[PDB]
């Protein structure tokens, strides 16, 4: 289970994207008994918050999910080669953390919500 | 809720496969307060581990999920009639528990991972 955990942390983002399951399997498992229980409960609700974020987009039960949100060059103007073959995910997170909330807001604002409503309507004709 | 729980435990696997929801609904609900809380938390994280296993395959939100992993006759060389009309799920688990981890590894090794990557690529053309 723990084997290979974060082993691709220094890999390129393209190469680290083939190991997502090792880092996804590892997110789910007196006063000190209460401490351990608090840790376990916190891990559970954190995992559920991440899954809820994935589910309010179209990305439920998926480790890679393509969306309908266009990429804005105000967030990053690098070409795919610099991102997926020259950079790592930690560097990318450092670069893109200032816009992450804007991206999340756009992911749940229009694309999944208007998509869902449009599929509600396309199931009428 | 509890009605019919494990009632098809002695049924054939084919017949017990029509009652999966009674056994799926029943997996989710001082020092003794801590004991009850530990039990509840353990049940929650166990359920979430099972759902994570289903989701890293293509089986998210499904009680029956068809896959792209071929069956190997090194795991069981019985024909469908012996399995789904003559055997029960407990006997099948006793027979197949030695290979279960190999099957799980194959389920998350290539089929869902390469499928997902191929759907990443088919969403380009």
């Amino acid at each position, epitope marked *: 289970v723990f084997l290979g955990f974060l082993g691709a942390a220094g890999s390129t983002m393209g190469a680290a994207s083939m190991t997502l399951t090792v880092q996804a399997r590892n997110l789910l498992s007196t006063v000190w008994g209460i401490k351990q229980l608090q840790a376990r409960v916190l891990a559970v609700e954190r995992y559920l918050r991440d899954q809820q974020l994935l589910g309010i987009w179209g990305c439920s039960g998926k480790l890679i999910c393509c969306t309908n949100v266009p990429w804005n060059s105000s967030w990053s103007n690098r070409n795919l080669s610099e991102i*997926w073959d020259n950079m790592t995910w930690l560097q990318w997170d450092k670069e893109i953390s200032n816009y992450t909330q804007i991206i999340y807001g756009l992911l749940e604002e229009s694309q999944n919500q208007q998509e869902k409503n449009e599929q509600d309507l396309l199931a009428l004709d | 809720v509890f009605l019919g729980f494990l009632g098809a435990a002695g049924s054939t696997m084919g017949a017990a496969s029509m009652t999966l929801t009674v056994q799926a609904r029943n997996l989710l609900s001082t020092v003794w307060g801590i004991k009850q809380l530990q039990a509840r938390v353990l049940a929650v994280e166990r359920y979430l581990r099972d759902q994570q296993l289903l989701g890293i395959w293509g089986c998210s939100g499904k009680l029956i999920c068809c896959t792209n992993v071929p069956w190997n006759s090194s795991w069981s060389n019985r024909n469908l009639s012996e399995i789904w009309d003559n055997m029960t799920w407990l006997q099948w688990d006793k027979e197949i528990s030695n290979y279960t981890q190999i099957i799980y590894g194959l389920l998350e090794e290539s089929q869902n991972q390469q499928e997902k990557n191929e759907q990443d690529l088919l969403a380009l053309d």
Partner: antibody
Amino acid sequence: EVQLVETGGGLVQPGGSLKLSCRASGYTFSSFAMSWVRQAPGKGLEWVSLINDRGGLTFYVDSVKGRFTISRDNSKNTLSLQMHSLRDGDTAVYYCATGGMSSALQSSKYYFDFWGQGALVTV
Amino acid sequence: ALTQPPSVSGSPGQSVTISCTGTSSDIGSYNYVSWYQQHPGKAPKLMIYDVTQRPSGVSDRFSGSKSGNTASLTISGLQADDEADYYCSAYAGRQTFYIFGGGTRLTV
């Protein structure tokens, strides 16, 4: 430095079968989508088939959809094209080329960058 | 298929333009039009990709452009080596991937 050498072109009776192969060198074979494009002798080029970089996705022109089978081995740096139930319209020089598509993590390569020599198939 | 003139004639020093008419579904929908040069008796060579872009090792004399459903290849400063069959290619979508135009003979 890129080299793509085709082997297996020859004469085959109508209704026969033939396996063309293309050996690649001078570049990362596993990082490129491959394609087979045929030119009949007096006519122009015609796209036959396409395979992605990993070898999991295969596309064919409808004229050879159920008959041809493109495959690749990245360990051996080989690209195979199996041909079954060969008709008279398949007489052509077949070229293996690099391109046709790319991964989602790469720029679009909707073109055939590096071509091979050619392999003559006659029915 | 893509309609292409069977022949285009020129002399050294001038500039010629080979046209390529296609359906709206292929050239009018996607900006992926490419031009190959096949000298007689040898394999094709990519001269232009993505309408305008050039590979490495290709002179500025070869250029490409698009207008609506028609893509054009301009060859300037004609030379002896330019005598070849110039083939059009267009990405026609997911169902039909690539459609090639009829070869055009250049006479210098």
